[PDB]
Amino acid sequence: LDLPLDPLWEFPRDRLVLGKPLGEGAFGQVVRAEAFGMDPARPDQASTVAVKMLKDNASDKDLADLVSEMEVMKLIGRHKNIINLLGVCTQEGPLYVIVECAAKGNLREFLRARRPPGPLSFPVLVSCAYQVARGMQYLESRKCIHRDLAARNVLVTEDNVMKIADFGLARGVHHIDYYKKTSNGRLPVKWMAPEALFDRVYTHQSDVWSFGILLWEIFTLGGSPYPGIPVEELFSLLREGHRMDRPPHCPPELYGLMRECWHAAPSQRPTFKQLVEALDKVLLAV
Numbered sequence: 001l002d003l004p005l006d007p008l009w010e011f012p013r014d015r016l017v018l019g020k021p022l023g024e025g026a027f028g029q030v031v032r033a034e035a036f037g038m039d040p041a042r043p044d045q046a047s048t049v050a051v052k053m054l055k056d057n058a059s060d061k062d063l064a065d066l067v068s069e070m071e072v073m074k075l076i077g078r079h080k081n082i083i084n085l086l087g088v089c090t091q092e093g094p095l096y097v098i099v100e101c102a103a104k105g106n107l108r109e110f111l112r113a114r115r116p117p118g119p120l121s122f123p124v125l126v127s128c129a130y131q132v133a134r135g136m137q138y139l140e141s142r143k144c145i146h147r148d149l150a151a152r153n154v155l156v157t158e159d160n161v162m163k164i165a166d167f168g169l170a171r172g173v174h175h176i177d178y179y180k181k182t183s184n185g186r187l188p189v190k191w192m193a194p195e196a197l198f199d200r201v202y203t204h205q206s207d208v209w210s211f212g213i214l215l216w217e218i219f220t221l222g223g224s225p226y227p228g229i230p231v232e233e234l235f236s237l238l239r240e241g242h243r244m245d246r247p248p249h250c251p252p253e254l255y256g257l258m259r260e261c262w263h264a265a266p267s268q269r270p271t272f273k274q275l276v277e278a279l280d281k282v283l284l285a286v
């Protein structure tokens with residue numbers, strides 16, 4: 001190891017107390033940790049953080065993936081609705097990528113655990129939707145494309161604030177593998193815009209399509225999209241302009257939003273800037 005030292009981002013690893021694993025990724029692993037003095041004004045002050053390090057039985061490509069990921073994260077910048085990079089540990093030990101801890105975990109499982117027999121009110125549901133749209137609007141302003149916007153990649157803090165993250169996906173040979181079923185049985189192709197799935201074209205508008213799927217997940221309280229459609233059957237359905245039906249207890253105002261995001265033509269889909277405005281109008285009204 002001979003990784004460069006960026007004092008701006010560098011944090012002493014001895015100021016980290018590692019704890020509870022939060023999840024195994026495809027090249028890294030996220031663990032919960034206590035950090036001391038993340039704020040140099042309060043150097044003995046504890047704070048809860050999440051640390052990404054290399055997975056067990058890791059190769060040289062995995063290290064390059066975690067390094068490239070670290071380099072991208074340094075440029076993302078700070079915004080209330082995107083995961084915030086706090087520091088890194090690159091010197092005299094294993095490579096650590098530190099971000100803020102979102103105490104309530106990923107949005108999919110946050111929603112799934114809070115299904116009524118209720119903890120989730122409709123205006124809190126709109127807020128989750130609005131917050132994710134706000135984060136995405138920031139990403140697009142920084143010319144950043146997500147490629148895999150889903151509820152499972154959005155995190156929930158103790159205060160129910162949404163933070164866009166990116167944990168997946170497995171690599172194929174030369175490109176990302178969207179077809180591989182995740183550990184949690186998720187099929188990533190179900191969030192893919194037609195131009196991303198059929199033409200390998202990724203824009204902010206393809207992320208808009210993905211947002212429409214994420215919206216469906218919020219308003220089904222963590223439902224899996226196209227509830228019983230194998231991925232082979234899904235392709236014809238999409239080509240032929242068929243879209244998911246309005247869910248059991250989803251207001252038309254929000255289902256209409258999903259439909260705008262799923263317009264076959266990327267140019268006829270709204271922008272994240274227009275989605276923030278329409279979700280703010282719904283949130284204010286409710």
Ligand SMILES: Cc1ccc(C(=O)Nc2ccc(CN3CCN(C)CC3)c(C(F)(F)F)c2)cc1C#Cc1cnc2cccnn12
Nearest residue numbers: 022030050051052083099101102105145146147164165166
């Ligand atoms: C430790 C850690 C490290 C990294 C990341 C991470 O998400 N990195 C990230 C990488 C890239 C991108 C953007 N790209 C997308 C692809 N794209 C093609 C290029 C740009 C983004 C994004 F947020 F901007 F989207 C984030 C999250 C965590 C976490 C955590 C955490 C906190 N609480 C909990 C609780 C349970 C589980 N985890 N956890």
